[PDB]
Amino acid sequence: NYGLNIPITGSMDTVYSNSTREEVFLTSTLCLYYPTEASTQISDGEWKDSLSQMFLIKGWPTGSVYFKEYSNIVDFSVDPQLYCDYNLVLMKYDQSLELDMSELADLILNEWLCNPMDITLYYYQQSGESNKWISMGSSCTVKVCPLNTQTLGIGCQTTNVDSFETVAENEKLAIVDVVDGINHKINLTTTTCTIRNCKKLGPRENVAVIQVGGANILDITADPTTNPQIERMMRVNWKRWWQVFYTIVDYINQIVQVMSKRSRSLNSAAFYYRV
Amino acid sequence: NIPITGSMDTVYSNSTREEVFLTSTLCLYYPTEASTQISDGEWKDSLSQMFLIKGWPTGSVYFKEYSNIVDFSVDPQLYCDYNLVLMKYDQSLELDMSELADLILNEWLCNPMDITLYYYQQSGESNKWISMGSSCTVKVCPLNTQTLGIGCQTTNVDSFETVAENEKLAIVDVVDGINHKINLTTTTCTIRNCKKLGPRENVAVIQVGGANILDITADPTTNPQIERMMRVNWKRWWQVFYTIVDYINQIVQVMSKRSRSLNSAAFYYRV
Amino acid sequence: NIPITGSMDTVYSNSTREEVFLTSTLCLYYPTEASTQISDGEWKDSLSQMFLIKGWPTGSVYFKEYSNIVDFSVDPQLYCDYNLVLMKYDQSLELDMSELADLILNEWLCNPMDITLYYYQQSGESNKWISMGSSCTVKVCPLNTQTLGIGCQTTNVDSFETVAENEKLAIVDVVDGINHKINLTTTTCTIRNCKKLGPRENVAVIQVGGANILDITADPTTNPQIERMMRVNWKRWWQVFYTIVDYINQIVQVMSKRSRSLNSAAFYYRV
Amino acid sequence: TVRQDLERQLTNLREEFNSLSQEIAMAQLIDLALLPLDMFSMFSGIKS
Numbered sequence A: 001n002y003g004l005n006i007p008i009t010g011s012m013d014t015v016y017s018n019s020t021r022e023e024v025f026l027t028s029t030l031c032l033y034y035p036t037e038a039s040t041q042i043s044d045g046e047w048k049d050s051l052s053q054m055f056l057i058k059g060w061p062t063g064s065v066y067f068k069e070y071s072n073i074v075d076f077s078v079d080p081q082l083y084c085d086y087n088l089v090l091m092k093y094d095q096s097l098e099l100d101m102s103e104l105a106d107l108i109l110n111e112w113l114c115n116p117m118d119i120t121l122y123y124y125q126q127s128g129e130s131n132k133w134i135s136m137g138s139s140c141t142v143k144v145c146p147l148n149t150q151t152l153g154i155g156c157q158t159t160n161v162d163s164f165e166t167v168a169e170n171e172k173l174a175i176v177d178v179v180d181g182i183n184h185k186i187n188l189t190t191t192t193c194t195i196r197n198c199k200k201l202g203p204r205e206n207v208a209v210i211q212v213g214g215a216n217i218l219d220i221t222a223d224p225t226t227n228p229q230i231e232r233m234m235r236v237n238w239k240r241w242w243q244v245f246y247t248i249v250d251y252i253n254q255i256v257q258v259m260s261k262r263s264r265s266l267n268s269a270a271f272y273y274r275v
Numbered sequence B, C: 001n002i003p004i005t006g007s008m009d010t011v012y013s014n015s016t017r018e019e020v021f022l023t024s025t026l027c028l029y030y031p032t033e034a035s036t037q038i039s040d041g042e043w044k045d046s047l048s049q050m051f052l053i054k055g056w057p058t059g060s061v062y063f064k065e066y067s068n069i070v071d072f073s074v075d076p077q078l079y080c081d082y083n084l085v086l087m088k089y090d091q092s093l094e095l096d097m098s099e100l101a102d103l104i105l106n107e108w109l110c111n112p113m114d115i116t117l118y119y120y121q122q123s124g125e126s127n128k129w130i131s132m133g134s135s136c137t138v139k140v141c142p143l144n145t146q147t148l149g150i151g152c153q154t155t156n157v158d159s160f161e162t163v164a165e166n167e168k169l170a171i172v173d174v175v176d177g178i179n180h181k182i183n184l185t186t187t188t189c190t191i192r193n194c195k196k197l198g199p200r201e202n203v204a205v206i207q208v209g210g211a212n213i214l215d216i217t218a219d220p221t222t223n224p225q226i227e228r229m230m231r232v233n234w235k236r237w238w239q240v241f242y243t244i245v246d247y248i249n250q251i252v253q254v255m256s257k258r259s260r261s262l263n264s265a266a267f268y269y270r271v
Numbered sequence D: 001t002v003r004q005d006l007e008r009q010l011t012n013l014r015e016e017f018n019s020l021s022q023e024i025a026m027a028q029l030i031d032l033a034l035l036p037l038d039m040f041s042m043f044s045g046i047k048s
């Protein structure tokens, strides 16, 4: 009950000062998320310790820097648990992974509120532009069937799964947007892949997605009309992972000056599960 | 146009969204590969109903298949009122995609060229030559004040500087101020001297594939981004169409109605 | 409609003929026998050049051939901004010719009819049922409040009272206020419940044959010779077309712009 | 069984009421208005 209604009065003259303190941990924690390809190319295994030593001179105490290895973009998109405070995610760009990278960026860079979806028993809808559905698991073959006012499937027969429309097939992660205001019947392989009704709150500003490779393709906003460039949608140019990591360490002061530690959650899950 | 005097303390009039939905037509131009992936044919009707939920009348939406980017590039006719052009990106079609986008997104006042006889300058920065047909091959030969070619014998076509070949569409710009002798394959391709007016706000282009590459402005220095050049990632054409339908409010808000006194009759799909 | 206040002493404006000719389009619908007797096919170009002399720009005139009156009656789309329908008359085509003239000259507001389920009434003097298709054979059966047909058995279709047979187009009026059950060949012919609003300013019908026989209004009493029901005698289609061309000022003067906020999108040949 | 009758409707009968209005007086419509017509009284005298 932090009194989020009474106004706060500032002043436009006095004074530029310091931030006093905050006592819940000794200090912040930086947190790299790199693919296995970095380790394989580096061909080492004292390199995490070397990078910690090289962070120490930049001014991070030893215990603050953590490293997390993931198989690749698609295998990491499933339940991306950001166990940490200042998250960087080095995403190697690869052609045909454009929408997968956009999915992961839209998932972690923004703060989501997800409810369960019991597909077998209910139809489902979308409240507004801010409401997506997020399907995750080993294999998500999300076949939808929209229904008119009369509960007759338009372009599909509700009793014949074949007639359905496959919005996204065989994805580790799929953010699906169907038209807002029309009931749908969903069908996906509930043994492997789960699905959730996820509304989009404001942005999550612990996380910085560093596109390691090509052009600027991360379209976080599903709206085709908008395509903003966020300060955390980082992009760097690479030939070698050692060069990438060295740039990160060298410029880490700016990397954390663009983010903000405040927007953090108890659980490491990338969304608030509101049941 | 006379001066339009107006206040600054006028009150905001009511929203015209319902009126534009009720008295306009939306115009979806999609590639045939979309339909092939869809593997359906009640899908036009289903999308029309899903548009009806958003506000358009039952007939207000017109779907237009086209073969592919170049086949739509040759003679782009937009038979309707609020135009969306789905435009898939694949590599090596960057320039032709940009040419098509420029042609549909800018108005052109333009007239034919009798290549067999005359020599044609270019008036200024906003004066191109648009060549369209089954197979265009512009071969230009600049001249001098003495009407002698430079880097090109006026007789021998072999010395001409080809600046397009096998293109279904070519927006060719040459040095503005020189008389050029052109050879172009008269049977299977036409060329017309065109001048660029203001934007054709009727249209908007949704690039379905990779990064921003559309450069409507031939000028190297300026590469502006226009509200009407949307870009949306994709893996499934159902997802693309569903996003378009869901955000059709915003696309139409981006797109403004045409305003140009056309002197040439053509078929439109109005209400 | 909001009031509009105007004086009675303001000076008359200038002639708007040039502006309307430059901004509008004219379109002629003629039977195939016209081209057959002309025995030509440069004649569309010839007549367009002829219209240009009186002041219709080159693309503004559209010649839309139709096979014959009865086959044209089905789904008449008038793809234009000023419509002329040349209409040859032969005896025994009186009623169908009058039906088509009524259909196009009078404005309509139509809704679908579901013959299979509902019993349908007629709202009043301005309401009709229009059936269009390759072959319409409507068979109606009136009912009581207890759903016992008068002069027919509601279950047996033979007893039904046929009101039109094997007609491409049929505008049927029946006794207003009595429920009817209908039987019309749902695969072939589509029937719609329409109300006759005011007149259509856009279309003029040039009867080419015989007596002033058209009766647009189903009411027996009123047979008013509206101005857009023009008539002319003929022996040569060339003479007919020259007459129309020479007097095209009078014809478009008799017609006028269409003023209705439509709700059914369709192709138009506007400029 | 029976074809009991057909029955006039609003569309057929509103013109009849229009043509029936002019016979209506006014010095005693006031008395009829003053008398309170209940469900019994209003429908008591329908066609006998």
Ligand SMILES: *[C@@H]1O[C@H](CO)[C@@H](O[C@@H]2O[C@H](CO)[C@@H](O[C@@H]3O[C@H](CO)[C@@H](O)[C@H](O)[C@@H]3O)[C@H](O)[C@H]2NC(C)=O)[C@H](O)[C@H]1NC(C)=O
Binding pocket: C115, C116, C157, C182, C183, C184, C185, C186
């Ligand atoms: C209005 O009246 C006509 C007059 O008959 C109706 O024609 C009837 O149409 C139905 C189907 O539309 C025919 O049914 C057929 O039944 C046989 C079995 O006997 C079956 O083998 C066929 O596949 C078909 O289902 C029926 O035979 C036909 N009447 C006659 C005398 O042949 C018409 O259907 C009526 N319109 C409506 C909307 O009901």
Ligand SMILES: *[C@@H]1O[C@H](CO)[C@@H](O)[C@H](O)[C@H]1NC(C)=O
Binding pocket: A017, A018
């Ligand atoms: C604020 O931080 C700076 C860091 O350079 C420090 O020098 C300064 O003393 C701090 N403010 C005060 C009032 O001490």
Ligand SMILES: *[C@@H]1O[C@H](CO)[C@@H](O)[C@H](O)[C@H]1NC(C)=O
Binding pocket: A119, A120, A161, A162, A187, A188, A189, A190
């Ligand atoms: C999903 O579809 C498969 C086959 O298309 C079907 O066996 C399965 O029952 C469906 N899922 C649900 C929850 O009905």
Ligand SMILES: *[C@@H]1O[C@H](CO)[C@@H](O)[C@H](O)[C@H]1NC(C)=O
Binding pocket: B014, B015, B018
């Ligand atoms: C005027 O604006 C209000 C917004 O609350 C809307 O409900 C109403 O329909 C508008 N008027 C018209 C004629 O649409």
Ligand SMILES: *[C@@H]1O[C@H](CO)[C@@H](O)[C@H](O)[C@H]1NC(C)=O
Binding pocket: B115, B116, B157, B182, B183, B184, B185, B186
């Ligand atoms: C262009 O050159 C080719 C090759 O000689 C020739 O066949 C063709 O007629 C030329 N076209 C024009 C328009 O000069």
Ligand SMILES: *[C@@H]1O[C@H](CO)[C@@H](O)[C@H](O)[C@H]1NC(C)=O
Binding pocket: C013, C014
């Ligand atoms: C109307 O006609 C008169 C007489 O020919 C002419 O003087 C005047 O300029 C015309 N008005 C316009 C607006 O052309």
Ligand SMILES: [Ca+2]
Binding pocket: A099, A100, A103, A171, A172, A173, A174, A175
């Ligand atoms: Ca995906």
Ligand SMILES: [Ca+2]
Binding pocket: A155, A156, A163, A164, A165, B040
């Ligand atoms: Ca389907």
Ligand SMILES: [Ca+2]
Binding pocket: A126, A128, A129, A130, A131, A132, A177, A178, A179, A180, B246
């Ligand atoms: Ca949505």
Ligand SMILES: [Ca+2]
Binding pocket: A219, A220, A221, A222, A223, A224, A225, A226, A227, B231, B232
């Ligand atoms: Ca976007």
Ligand SMILES: [Ca+2]
Binding pocket: B073, B095, B096, B099, B167, B168, B169, B170
């Ligand atoms: Ca091209």
Ligand SMILES: [Ca+2]
Binding pocket: B151, B152, B158, B159, B160, B161
């Ligand atoms: Ca040369």
Ligand SMILES: [Ca+2]
Binding pocket: B122, B124, B125, B126, B127, B128, B173, B174, B175, B176
């Ligand atoms: Ca130029």
Ligand SMILES: [Ca+2]
Binding pocket: B215, B216, B217, B218, B219, B220, B221, B222, B223, B224
């Ligand atoms: Ca440019």
Ligand SMILES: [Ca+2]
Binding pocket: C151, C152, C159, C160, C161
């Ligand atoms: Ca009978």
Ligand SMILES: [Ca+2]
Binding pocket: C095, C096, C099, C164, C167, C168, C169, C170, C171
């Ligand atoms: Ca008829």
